Design an enzyme around this catalytic site. Structure first.
Site, PDB file in Angstrom:
ATOM      1  N   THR A   1     -12.085  -5.687   6.485  1.00 29.92           N
ATOM      2  CA  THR A   1     -12.008  -7.126   6.276  1.00 29.92           C
ATOM      3  C   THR A   1     -12.652  -7.566   4.970  1.00 29.92           C
ATOM      4  O   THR A   1     -12.445  -8.708   4.547  1.00 29.92           O
ATOM      5  CB  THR A   1     -12.672  -7.866   7.440  1.00 29.92           C
ATOM      6  OG1 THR A   1     -14.010  -7.383   7.610  1.00 29.92           O
ATOM      7  CG2 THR A   1     -11.892  -7.645   8.725  1.00 29.92           C
TER       8      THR A   1
ATOM      9  N   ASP B   1      14.371   5.257  -4.734  1.00 29.63           N
ATOM     10  CA  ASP B   1      13.684   5.274  -6.020  1.00 29.63           C
ATOM     11  C   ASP B   1      14.256   6.332  -6.958  1.00 29.63           C
ATOM     12  O   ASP B   1      15.475   6.518  -7.030  1.00 29.63           O
ATOM     13  CB  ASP B   1      12.192   5.517  -5.791  1.00 29.63           C
ATOM     14  CG  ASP B   1      11.322   4.836  -6.821  1.00 29.63           C
ATOM     15  OD1 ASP B   1      11.365   5.237  -8.003  1.00 29.63           O
ATOM     16  OD2 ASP B   1      10.592   3.896  -6.444  1.00 29.63           O
TER      17      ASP B   1
ATOM     18  N   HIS C   1       7.958   8.345 -10.523  1.00 33.56           N
ATOM     19  CA  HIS C   1       7.773   7.051  -9.872  1.00 33.56           C
ATOM     20  C   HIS C   1       8.011   7.148  -8.368  1.00 33.56           C
ATOM     21  O   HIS C   1       7.182   6.705  -7.565  1.00 33.56           O
ATOM     22  CB  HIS C   1       8.708   6.018 -10.500  1.00 33.56           C
ATOM     23  CG  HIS C   1       8.424   4.606 -10.086  1.00 33.56           C
ATOM     24  ND1 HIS C   1       9.128   3.965  -9.090  1.00 33.56           N
ATOM     25  CD2 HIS C   1       7.523   3.706 -10.548  1.00 33.56           C
ATOM     26  CE1 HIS C   1       8.669   2.735  -8.950  1.00 33.56           C
ATOM     27  NE2 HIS C   1       7.694   2.552  -9.822  1.00 33.56           N
TER      28      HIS C   1
ATOM     29  N   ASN D   1       6.715  -7.438 -11.714  1.00 29.19           N
ATOM     30  CA  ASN D   1       5.555  -7.348 -12.593  1.00 29.19           C
ATOM     31  C   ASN D   1       5.703  -8.253 -13.811  1.00 29.19           C
ATOM     32  O   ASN D   1       5.421  -7.848 -14.940  1.00 29.19           O
ATOM     33  CB  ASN D   1       5.324  -5.905 -13.038  1.00 29.19           C
ATOM     34  CG  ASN D   1       5.245  -4.938 -11.872  1.00 29.19           C
ATOM     35  OD1 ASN D   1       4.771  -5.287 -10.792  1.00 29.19           O
ATOM     36  ND2 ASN D   1       5.707  -3.713 -12.088  1.00 29.19           N
TER      37      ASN D   1
ATOM     38  N   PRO E   1      15.000 -13.953   1.198  1.00 25.81           N
ATOM     39  CA  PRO E   1      13.948 -14.357   2.145  1.00 25.81           C
ATOM     40  C   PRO E   1      13.818 -13.447   3.355  1.00 25.81           C
ATOM     41  O   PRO E   1      12.713 -13.309   3.894  1.00 25.81           O
ATOM     42  CB  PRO E   1      14.377 -15.774   2.557  1.00 25.81           C
ATOM     43  CG  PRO E   1      15.322 -16.225   1.497  1.00 25.81           C
ATOM     44  CD  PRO E   1      16.024 -14.995   1.027  1.00 25.81           C
TER      45      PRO E   1
ATOM     46  N   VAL F   1      13.838 -10.265   3.809  1.00 26.60           N
ATOM     47  CA  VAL F   1      13.089  -9.018   3.687  1.00 26.60           C
ATOM     48  C   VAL F   1      11.611  -9.341   3.508  1.00 26.60           C
ATOM     49  O   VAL F   1      11.196 -10.496   3.652  1.00 26.60           O
ATOM     50  CB  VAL F   1      13.615  -8.153   2.528  1.00 26.60           C
ATOM     51  CG1 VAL F   1      15.068  -7.773   2.772  1.00 26.60           C
ATOM     52  CG2 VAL F   1      13.457  -8.882   1.203  1.00 26.60           C
TER      53      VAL F   1
ATOM     54  N   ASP G   1       5.693 -12.739   0.889  1.00 31.63           N
ATOM     55  CA  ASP G   1       5.271 -12.651   2.280  1.00 31.63           C
ATOM     56  C   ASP G   1       3.859 -12.111   2.448  1.00 31.63           C
ATOM     57  O   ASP G   1       3.149 -12.538   3.365  1.00 31.63           O
ATOM     58  CB  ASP G   1       6.236 -11.756   3.067  1.00 31.63           C
ATOM     59  CG  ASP G   1       7.648 -12.303   3.101  1.00 31.63           C
ATOM     60  OD1 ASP G   1       7.875 -13.324   3.780  1.00 31.63           O
ATOM     61  OD2 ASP G   1       8.535 -11.713   2.452  1.00 31.63           O
TER      62      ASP G   1
ATOM     63  N   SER H   1       5.123  -2.071  -7.606  1.00 33.43           N
ATOM     64  CA  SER H   1       5.743  -0.871  -7.063  1.00 33.43           C
ATOM     65  C   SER H   1       4.753  -0.028  -6.274  1.00 33.43           C
ATOM     66  O   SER H   1       5.169   0.778  -5.437  1.00 33.43           O
ATOM     67  CB  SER H   1       6.354  -0.030  -8.188  1.00 33.43           C
ATOM     68  OG  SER H   1       7.462  -0.683  -8.779  1.00 33.43           O
TER      69      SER H   1
ATOM     70  N   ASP I   1      -8.877 -14.128   1.382  1.00 36.30           N
ATOM     71  CA  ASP I   1      -9.770 -13.239   0.649  1.00 36.30           C
ATOM     72  C   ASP I   1      -9.415 -13.100  -0.825  1.00 36.30           C
ATOM     73  O   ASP I   1     -10.213 -12.538  -1.583  1.00 36.30           O
ATOM     74  CB  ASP I   1      -9.779 -11.850   1.295  1.00 36.30           C
ATOM     75  CG  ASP I   1     -10.529 -11.825   2.609  1.00 36.30           C
ATOM     76  OD1 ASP I   1     -11.115 -12.864   2.978  1.00 36.30           O
ATOM     77  OD2 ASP I   1     -10.536 -10.768   3.275  1.00 36.30           O
TER      78      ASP I   1
HETATM   79 CA   LIG Z   1      10.436 -12.763   3.506  1.00 38.43          CA
HETATM   80 CA   LIG Z   2     -12.564 -11.054   4.368  1.00 39.42          CA
END
Ligand SMILES: [Ca+2]
Ligand SMILES: [Ca+2]
Length: 279
Positions: free
Chosen positions: A16, A39, A69, A161, A175, A177, A200, A224, A260
């Protein structure tokens, strides 16, 4: 189980708070699940895969990973030392050439292939697909990712990126995925990571140590790298029976570490993938 002196990304998703070095995880470790890595390929002979990885499809002259990669991302999914789900099965689909590039028509064909190929594989705990790639917006690429998700596969894709809104990039802007942003070891948003309302979840993405071709290792950064963290976590939770392929992304956001992260623009979720392991 506990892996001491683990890569910081693995320790972060089992804690956490930042700054720990132990990866806490359940011994099931994603056994019975399958993860397709779409990939540059996978160096399946790498000792870190323990014979659990294999190439099933390539769209070029060879199935070998001449870039590294795809081997790096697959190691984050389920290599012994650097993986989230250390007992899952890995399948490689080479849609990118050894330079890291590929045409959209080839990437689309790779996703359609995974939707059909899973029907002749033994994956009792479920199927995941990890797409650490993307480019400019394309409705056809978004549609192919939605098809794969609809067929019963948990699809995780990189946000990009560009340090921009992911709504102008595909397949990150689809949306349905699971679009993954990147963070660093100080719980800051990675300076390169895309953002926006379509995101997400966030995963560890900066300075990620994993496998590399030639039987070696190296540390690289990018969204990635964050995607296989989420793809591996989905296979880990699906093996435990906590969620299904259709609802894995929502369950991960429901149980993530909330608030966080820093340098999160307004309108972007402040959620960090977390496995909720309690010994
Ligand atoms: Ca989504
Ligand atoms: Ca925390």
């Amino acid at each position: 189980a506990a892996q001491t002196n683990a890569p910081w990304g693995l320790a972060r998703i089992s804690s956490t708070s930042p700054g720990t070095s132990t990866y806490y995880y359940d011994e099931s470790a994603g056994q019975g699940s399958c993860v397709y890595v779409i990939d540059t390929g996978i160096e399946a002979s790498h000792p870190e895969f323990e014979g659990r990885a294999q190439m099933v499809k390539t769209y070029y002259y060879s199935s070998r990973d001449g870039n590294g990669h795809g081997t790096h991302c697959a190691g984050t999914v389920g290599s012994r030392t650097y993986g989230v789900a250390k007992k899952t099965q890995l399948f490689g689909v080479k849609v990118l050439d050894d330079n890291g590039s590929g045409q959209y028509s080839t990437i689309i064909a790779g996703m359609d292939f995974v939707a059909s190929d899973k029907n002749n594989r033994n994956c009792p705990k479920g199927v995941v697909a990890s797409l650490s790639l993307g480019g400019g917006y394309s409705s056809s690429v978004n549609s192919a990712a939605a098809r794969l998700q609809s067929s019963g596969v948990m699809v995780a894709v990189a946000a990009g990126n560009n340090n921009a809104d992911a709504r102008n990039y595909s397949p990150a802007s689809e949306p349905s995925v699971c679009t993954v942003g990147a963070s660093d070891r100080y719980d800051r948003r990675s300076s390169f990571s895309n953002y926006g309302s379509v995101l997400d979840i966030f995963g560890p993405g900066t300075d990620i140590l994993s496998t590399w071709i030639g039987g070696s290792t190296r540390s690289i950064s990018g969204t990635s790298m964050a995607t296989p963290h989420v793809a591996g976590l989905a296979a880990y939770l699906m093996t435990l029976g906590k969620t299904t392929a259709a609802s894995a992304c929502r369950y991960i956001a429901d149980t993530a570490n909330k608030g966080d992260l820093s340098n999160i623009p307004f309108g972007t979720v402040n959620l960090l993938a977390y496995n909720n392991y309690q010994a």
